[PDB]
Write a protein that binds this DNA or RNA. Structure first.
Length: 340
DNA sequence: GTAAAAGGTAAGGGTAATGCACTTTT
DNA sequence: CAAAAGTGCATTACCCTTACCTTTTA
């Protein structure tokens, strides 16, 4: 499910055996991993890893592999032993797994019994004491972080990514029936309460109004209007008001629209409006951006030009006087006069 | 008794992993 | 040509943190 301490130990061991097999050094392997395409035994080795580690893609296995020998750029995929915040280091999870295994062997519990007692509404004194000692052995990290981690990692629910159409529906009806009560709902569906929230907030809440296609000009414009009415930005509320895109989709689209672009001057605005006006005339009453992006070639991305067009429509008085076609032609002509 | 510390639950938040359409390489 | 594999882009799987309660501990 996730890259744990075991997965790193497997990689390192498989790599040590690789070197011994072909009489190679770790420096020689690191040199091969600087190249884009792999060859020979190293190519055969990765193929094995992909098969031996089905929980991960070849792309992500390579990212970890290249990180293991250190290849610049792959630092973020490198092994982490400990941290005070965010993701748990491989040594932290190892300590937890050791403490849980010790606590479970004591008192004679199964790991299933352990998970149920953790999630038994109000945990008993033995569980409360288990937490206390665990916090001391991870004193660097906030005790609440460890508390949330353990619950998520040790649960009685069936953890899986596949939600069916019916299960999605059953969730909906539960929310209609009981409200935003994910613990009550979660137990009814044998699902981790947080997973129920996520399924609802990011998928099922939207119903059939959710879109996967490319954003429309109207959709992108609406997105800009709602961010103007508002940390600073609550993407969950943003998606709710837009109604056709998830919070992460909105968060992503907004970032692309507002990315750092080259300063649009008078001449730059003219070229854009002229390239748009060509698409308005030659093509149907629509804007084909495929040709516009290509002619820009690196200076602006699609979303950046769209962002600029939105602001031009809002600021140029011609767009309040005339329809899109004529207003654009008027906007260009007015832009050409001031250039004198 | 008290106040401090910690559990329980839901809102808020964010990135590595991945799918996809694509080019590139064997 | 098929097939294996790399890659930018948008989405997904999956996780963590904060806020605000109630409950337990000292």
């Amino acid at each position: 499910a996730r890259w744990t301490a075991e997965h790193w130990d497997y990689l390192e061991r498989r790599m040590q055996n690789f070197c011994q097999t072909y009489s190679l050094d770790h420096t020689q392997v690191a040199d091969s991993l600087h190249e884009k395409r792999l060859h020979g035994p190293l190519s055969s080795l990765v193929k094995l890893l992909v098969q031996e580690m089905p929980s991960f893609t070849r792309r992500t296995i390579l990212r970890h592999l290249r990180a293991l020998y250190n290849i610049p750029g792959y630092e973020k995929y490198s092994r982490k032993n400990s941290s005070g915040r965010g993701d748990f280091g491989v040594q932290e999870t190892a300590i937890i797994s050791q403490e849980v295994h010790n606590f479970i062997m004591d008192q004679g519990w199964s790991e299933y019994q352990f998970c149920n007692q953790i999630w038994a509404g109000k945990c008993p004194k033995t569980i409360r004491m288990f937490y206390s000692n665990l916090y001391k052995k991870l004193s660097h990290r906030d005790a609440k972080s460890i508390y949330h981690h353990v619950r998520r990692a040790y649960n009685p629910f069936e953890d899986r990514c596949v939600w069916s159409k019916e299960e999605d529906e059953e969730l909906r009806k539960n929310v209609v029936e009981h409200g935003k009560c994910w613990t009550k709902i979660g137990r009814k569906m044998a699902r981790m309460p947080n997973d129920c929230r996520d399924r609802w907030r990011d998928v099922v809440r939207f119903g059939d109004k959710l879109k996967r296609n490319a954003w429309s000009l109207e959709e992108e414009t609406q997105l800009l209007q709602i961010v103007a009415e508002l940390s600073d930005i609550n993407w969950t509320l943003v998606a709710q008001m837009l109604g056709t895109r998830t919070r992460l989709q909105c968060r992503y689209k907004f970032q692309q629209l507002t990315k750092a672009a080259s300063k649009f001057e008078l001449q730059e605005n003219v070229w854009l409006l002229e390239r748009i006006y060509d698409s308005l005339l030659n093509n149907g009453g629509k804007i084909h951006w495929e040709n516009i992006v290509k002619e820009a070639n690196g200076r602006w991305t699609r979303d950046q030009m769209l962002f600029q067009f939105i602001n031009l429509k809002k600021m140029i008085p011609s767009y309040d006087n005339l329809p899109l076609l004529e207003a654009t032609k008027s906007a260009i002509d007015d832009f050409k006069v001031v250039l004198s």
